[PDB]
Enzyme design. Structure first.
Site, PDB file in Angstrom:
ATOM      1  N   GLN A 257      93.544 -58.523 -66.303  1.00  0.00           N
ATOM      2  CA  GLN A 257      92.366 -58.339 -65.474  1.00  0.00           C
ATOM      3  C   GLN A 257      91.627 -57.058 -65.741  1.00  0.00           C
ATOM      4  O   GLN A 257      92.044 -56.178 -66.492  1.00  0.00           O
ATOM      5  CB  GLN A 257      92.794 -58.421 -64.026  1.00  0.00           C
ATOM      6  CG  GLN A 257      93.365 -59.826 -63.826  1.00  0.00           C
ATOM      7  CD  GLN A 257      93.507 -60.304 -62.404  1.00  0.00           C
ATOM      8  OE1 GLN A 257      93.814 -59.530 -61.489  1.00  0.00           O
ATOM      9  NE2 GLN A 257      93.344 -61.612 -62.217  1.00  0.00           N
ATOM     10  N   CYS A 258      90.487 -56.935 -65.080  1.00  0.00           N
ATOM     11  CA  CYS A 258      89.685 -55.757 -65.351  1.00  0.00           C
ATOM     12  C   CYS A 258      90.343 -54.447 -64.923  1.00  0.00           C
ATOM     13  O   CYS A 258      90.195 -53.442 -65.604  1.00  0.00           O
ATOM     14  CB  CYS A 258      88.288 -55.899 -64.672  1.00  0.00           C
ATOM     15  SG  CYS A 258      88.288 -55.981 -62.816  1.00  0.00           S
TER      16      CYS A 258
ATOM     17  N   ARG B  46      92.887 -49.036 -66.055  1.00  0.00           N
ATOM     18  CA  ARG B  46      93.999 -48.153 -65.819  1.00  0.00           C
ATOM     19  C   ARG B  46      94.714 -47.845 -67.161  1.00  0.00           C
ATOM     20  O   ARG B  46      95.080 -46.712 -67.439  1.00  0.00           O
ATOM     21  CB  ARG B  46      95.013 -48.779 -64.832  1.00  0.00           C
ATOM     22  CG  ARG B  46      96.052 -47.840 -64.386  1.00  0.00           C
ATOM     23  CD  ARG B  46      96.901 -48.354 -63.200  1.00  0.00           C
ATOM     24  NE  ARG B  46      96.142 -48.493 -61.930  1.00  0.00           N
ATOM     25  CZ  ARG B  46      95.962 -49.667 -61.297  1.00  0.00           C
ATOM     26  NH1 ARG B  46      96.381 -50.818 -61.835  1.00  0.00           N
ATOM     27  NH2 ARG B  46      95.317 -49.707 -60.126  1.00  0.00           N
TER      28      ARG B  46
ATOM     29  N   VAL C  18      94.609 -50.549 -56.342  1.00  0.00           N
ATOM     30  CA  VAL C  18      93.700 -51.289 -55.449  1.00  0.00           C
ATOM     31  C   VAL C  18      93.854 -52.783 -55.479  1.00  0.00           C
ATOM     32  O   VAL C  18      94.262 -53.358 -56.489  1.00  0.00           O
ATOM     33  CB  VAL C  18      92.186 -50.995 -55.734  1.00  0.00           C
ATOM     34  CG1 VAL C  18      91.971 -49.515 -55.613  1.00  0.00           C
ATOM     35  CG2 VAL C  18      91.693 -51.572 -57.135  1.00  0.00           C
ATOM     36  N   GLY C  19      93.522 -53.412 -54.347  1.00  0.00           N
ATOM     37  CA  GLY C  19      93.582 -54.861 -54.298  1.00  0.00           C
ATOM     38  C   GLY C  19      92.337 -55.514 -54.883  1.00  0.00           C
ATOM     39  O   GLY C  19      92.391 -56.641 -55.387  1.00  0.00           O
ATOM     40  N   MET C  20      91.183 -54.858 -54.784  1.00  0.00           N
ATOM     41  CA  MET C  20      89.941 -55.404 -55.318  1.00  0.00           C
ATOM     42  C   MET C  20      89.289 -54.281 -56.096  1.00  0.00           C
ATOM     43  O   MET C  20      89.275 -53.131 -55.633  1.00  0.00           O
ATOM     44  CB  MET C  20      88.990 -55.849 -54.201  1.00  0.00           C
ATOM     45  CG  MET C  20      89.544 -57.057 -53.435  1.00  0.00           C
ATOM     46  SD  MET C  20      88.726 -57.453 -51.872  1.00  0.00           S
ATOM     47  CE  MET C  20      89.390 -56.158 -50.650  1.00  0.00           C
ATOM     48  N   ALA C  21      88.746 -54.622 -57.270  1.00  0.00           N
ATOM     49  CA  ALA C  21      88.142 -53.618 -58.124  1.00  0.00           C
ATOM     50  C   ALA C  21      87.082 -52.772 -57.464  1.00  0.00           C
ATOM     51  O   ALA C  21      86.934 -51.600 -57.757  1.00  0.00           O
ATOM     52  CB  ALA C  21      87.570 -54.301 -59.411  1.00  0.00           C
TER      53      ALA C  21
ATOM     54  N   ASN D  34      88.264 -59.313 -68.641  1.00  0.00           N
ATOM     55  CA  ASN D  34      87.810 -60.343 -67.695  1.00  0.00           C
ATOM     56  C   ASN D  34      86.358 -60.716 -67.767  1.00  0.00           C
ATOM     57  O   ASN D  34      85.842 -61.340 -66.836  1.00  0.00           O
ATOM     58  CB  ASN D  34      88.232 -59.975 -66.244  1.00  0.00           C
ATOM     59  CG  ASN D  34      88.938 -61.154 -65.533  1.00  0.00           C
ATOM     60  OD1 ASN D  34      88.891 -62.304 -65.986  1.00  0.00           O
ATOM     61  ND2 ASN D  34      89.622 -60.840 -64.430  1.00  0.00           N
TER      62      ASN D  34
END
EC number: 3.5.1.78
Length: 190
Positions: free
Chosen positions: A51-52, A57, A71-74, A142
């Site tokens: 994923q992005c 990271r 984080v849970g969402m970008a 992504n």
């Protein structure tokens, strides 16, 4: 043409691999739960393959020795205010600059999208890799899932308008929202 999940598509600067993230033929349940989908580099957790957030990271880890937290969402990255140096766990300040800021984007900066359009409810993160007079090049996972041209170490180029002392990026998608870029620096602006 898009490649199977996990296919090496090319490299970002510094030799950071970009992998295909097409998990359309995989079990969603399994994709979310199985440990085979967790990316690590020497005991350090990078993110969910491919994923992005995982790419951003890993790029910061490999080229700067730092990471941002889990984080849970970008789009939540835009609210982080520090990076962690992995070698010694020291904390470094990180500031957010909204699109249209007089603080120009720079190579290495995190570029964050809010949720919306192409990026649905997750938002997105890419790394800015090059600055030009009327555009920036970025690298990310992504978005592009097909191999990059030989020698190309970026996934997309975004138009950059520089007017009246401000920098505004325009996305290649029409229905998205760019929040802005993050730079490792202390807050030294009013």
């Amino acid at each position: 043409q898009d490649a199977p999940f996990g296919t090496l598509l090319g490299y970002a600067p510094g030799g950071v691999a970009i992998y295909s993230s097409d998990y359309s033929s995989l079990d969603p349940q399994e994709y979310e739960d199985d440990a085979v989908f967790r990316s690590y580099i020497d005991d350090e957790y990078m993110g969910h393959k491919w994923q992005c957030v995982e790419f951003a990271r890993r790029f910061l880890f490999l080229n700067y020795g730092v990471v941002f937290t889990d984080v849970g969402m970008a789009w939540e990255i835009f609210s982080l205010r520090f990076l962690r140096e992995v070698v010694n766990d020291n904390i470094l300040p990180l500031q957010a600059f909204p699109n249209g800021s007089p603080r120009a984007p720079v190579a290495g900066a995190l570029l964050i999208w809010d949720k919306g359009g192409e990026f649905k409810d997750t938002g997105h993160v890419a790394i800015i890799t090059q600055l030009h007079g009327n555009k920036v090049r970025i690298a990310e996972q992504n978005v592009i899932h097909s191999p990059l041209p030989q020698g190309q170490q970026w996934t997309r180029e975004l138009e950059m308008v520089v007017e009246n002392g401000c920098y505004t990026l325009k996305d290649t998608f029409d229905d998205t929202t760019i929040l802005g870029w993050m730079i490792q620096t202390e807050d030294t602006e009013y």
